Amino acid sequence: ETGIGTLIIFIAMVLVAAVAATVLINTAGSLQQRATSTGSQTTNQVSTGLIVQSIYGM
Amino acid sequence: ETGIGTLIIFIAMVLVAAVAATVLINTAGSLQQRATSTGSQTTNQVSTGLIVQSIYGM
């Protein structure tokens, strides 16, 4: 009967959907750390600087 | 996310305004001492002099 064949494919459908879910989570986690670090590094880059007061010679 | 880029440029705008402020203050302080000294030196120069009373010979 059709009942047996339906159950077999059902298991396969669940496993496939889990794979595509894993890709999206892993990619978002990788891009999270890069975007956070870039923001913090740029903030330090703009604000920091050195200034010359006076120059003397002998 | 227009808010992020606004804040970054804002920091730079503040720093540039501080630079132009420093130039005007430093220049005015330098010109102050020259203008003060010149006035006092000229006052002495005009008012001072020597006079000959009488001349004798042997």
XYZ file of N, CA, C and O in Angstrom, chain B:
232
model
N 20.766 50.960 7.423
C 21.448 51.231 8.730
C 22.295 52.499 8.605
O 23.518 52.470 8.749
N 21.607 53.621 8.356
C 22.227 54.904 8.050
C 22.794 55.541 9.321
O 23.633 56.437 9.241
N 22.343 55.051 10.484
C 22.723 55.580 11.785
C 24.184 55.313 12.146
O 24.788 56.099 12.875
N 24.733 54.206 11.626
C 26.079 53.745 11.945
C 27.105 54.687 11.311
O 28.016 55.152 11.996
N 26.934 54.961 10.010
C 27.842 55.793 9.235
C 27.819 57.259 9.664
O 28.818 57.961 9.514
N 26.669 57.697 10.196
C 26.449 59.056 10.667
C 27.335 59.338 11.882
O 27.928 60.411 11.975
N 27.423 58.355 12.790
C 28.131 58.487 14.056
C 29.644 58.500 13.837
O 30.358 59.195 14.560
N 30.113 57.734 12.841
C 31.529 57.586 12.529
C 32.078 58.910 11.992
O 33.142 59.356 12.422
N 31.330 59.535 11.071
C 31.727 60.778 10.422
C 31.617 61.939 11.415
O 32.412 62.876 11.351
N 30.655 61.841 12.346
C 30.407 62.840 13.379
C 31.660 63.078 14.223
O 31.974 64.224 14.540
N 32.355 61.986 14.578
C 33.562 62.013 15.394
C 34.656 62.797 14.665
O 35.356 63.600 15.283
N 34.766 62.572 13.348
C 35.771 63.196 12.499
C 35.519 64.697 12.355
O 36.472 65.471 12.281
N 34.236 65.088 12.323
C 33.814 66.472 12.152
C 34.213 67.305 13.371
O 34.567 68.474 13.230
N 34.142 66.683 14.556
C 34.432 67.318 15.834
C 35.936 67.577 15.943
O 36.348 68.637 16.414
N 36.738 66.608 15.474
C 38.190 66.639 15.578
C 38.785 67.705 14.657
O 39.782 68.331 15.013
N 38.161 67.900 13.485
C 38.610 68.855 12.479
C 38.363 70.280 12.978
O 39.199 71.160 12.769
N 37.225 70.482 13.660
C 36.814 71.776 14.188
C 37.744 72.229 15.314
O 37.925 73.430 15.516
N 38.324 71.258 16.032
C 39.249 71.506 17.128
C 40.594 72.005 16.601
O 41.252 72.807 17.262
N 40.981 71.522 15.410
C 42.252 71.841 14.771
C 42.264 73.318 14.372
O 43.220 74.029 14.679
N 41.185 73.762 13.709
C 41.044 75.122 13.208
C 40.944 76.122 14.360
O 41.346 77.275 14.212
N 40.402 75.658 15.495
C 40.272 76.443 16.713
C 41.647 76.714 17.323
O 41.900 77.816 17.807
N 42.522 75.698 17.272
C 43.846 75.720 17.881
C 44.755 76.712 17.153
O 45.554 77.395 17.792
N 44.608 76.785 15.821
C 45.422 77.632 14.955
C 45.202 79.101 15.318
O 46.167 79.856 15.438
N 43.930 79.481 15.513
C 43.523 80.861 15.738
C 43.988 81.353 17.109
O 44.344 82.522 17.249
N 43.977 80.454 18.105
C 44.351 80.773 19.476
C 45.868 80.959 19.563
O 46.336 81.911 20.188
N 46.617 80.056 18.911
C 48.073 80.029 18.951
C 48.665 81.253 18.252
O 49.686 81.777 18.694
N 48.012 81.693 17.166
C 48.467 82.814 16.354
C 48.247 84.129 17.102
O 49.096 85.019 17.046
N 47.107 84.230 17.800
C 46.715 85.422 18.540
C 47.631 85.639 19.743
O 47.923 86.782 20.095
N 48.070 84.534 20.360
C 48.976 84.555 21.499
C 50.387 84.994 21.112
O 51.075 85.634 21.906
N 50.796 84.638 19.886
C 52.106 84.967 19.344
C 52.183 86.448 18.977
O 53.218 87.081 19.181
N 51.076 86.981 18.442
C 50.988 88.360 17.981
C 50.821 89.318 19.160
O 51.132 90.502 19.036
N 50.324 88.791 20.289
C 50.047 89.557 21.497
C 51.346 90.116 22.078
O 51.404 91.293 22.433
N 52.375 89.262 22.152
C 53.628 89.569 22.827
C 54.456 90.555 22.004
O 55.170 91.379 22.573
N 54.349 90.454 20.672
C 55.066 91.319 19.746
C 54.489 92.733 19.800
O 55.245 93.702 19.831
N 53.151 92.830 19.829
C 52.436 94.098 19.789
C 52.600 94.867 21.100
O 52.622 96.098 21.091
N 52.710 94.130 22.215
C 52.849 94.705 23.546
C 54.255 95.277 23.723
O 54.412 96.377 24.251
N 55.263 94.519 23.268
C 56.668 94.862 23.433
C 57.056 96.050 22.554
O 57.858 96.882 22.970
N 56.472 96.114 21.346
C 56.759 97.151 20.363
C 56.287 98.511 20.878
O 56.983 99.509 20.701
N 55.111 98.526 21.521
C 54.511 99.731 22.074
C 55.354 100.348 23.189
O 55.521 101.566 23.233
N 55.884 99.489 24.071
C 56.656 99.903 25.233
C 58.053 100.371 24.829
O 58.592 101.295 25.438
N 58.624 99.720 23.804
C 59.958 100.021 23.302
C 59.966 101.368 22.582
O 60.946 102.106 22.670
N 58.865 101.671 21.877
C 58.708 102.903 21.118
C 58.512 104.083 22.069
O 59.027 105.170 21.813
N 57.776 103.844 23.166
C 57.492 104.843 24.188
C 58.795 105.301 24.847
O 58.959 106.488 25.130
N 59.709 104.347 25.073
C 61.022 104.611 25.641
C 61.893 105.363 24.635
O 62.629 106.269 25.018
N 61.782 104.984 23.353
C 62.626 105.485 22.276
C 62.377 106.975 22.039
O 63.325 107.729 21.825
N 61.101 107.379 22.084
C 60.675 108.735 21.761
C 61.052 109.681 22.905
O 61.520 110.792 22.658
N 60.878 109.211 24.149
C 60.959 110.050 25.336
C 62.400 110.266 25.801
O 62.679 111.248 26.487
N 63.305 109.350 25.425
C 64.682 109.357 25.901
C 65.549 110.229 24.991
O 65.358 110.244 23.774
N 66.498 110.950 25.606
C 67.449 111.794 24.899
C 68.514 112.381 25.825
O 68.362 112.365 27.046
N 69.589 112.897 25.212
C 70.688 113.549 25.909
C 70.805 114.994 25.428
O 70.524 115.286 24.266
N 71.231 115.883 26.336
C 71.392 117.300 26.040
C 72.753 117.786 26.535
O 73.212 117.389 27.606
N 73.379 118.655 25.729
C 74.662 119.272 26.032
C 74.395 120.625 26.690
O 73.637 121.437 26.159
N 75.031 120.848 27.847
C 74.843 122.061 28.629
C 75.808 123.143 28.146
O 75.370 124.166 27.620
N 77.115 122.900 28.327
C 78.169 123.839 27.964
C 79.474 123.096 27.684
O 79.693 122.001 28.201
N 80.334 123.716 26.862
C 81.617 123.151 26.464
C 82.726 124.154 26.789
O 82.613 125.337 26.468
N 83.793 123.653 27.430
C 84.961 124.439 27.799
C 86.226 123.802 27.224
O 86.278 122.590 27.020
N 87.241 124.643 26.980
C 88.532 124.216 26.461
C 89.695 124.884 27.192
O 89.563 126.007 27.676
N 90.830 124.175 27.249
C 92.024 124.625 27.951
C 93.177 124.767 26.958
O 93.390 123.892 26.122
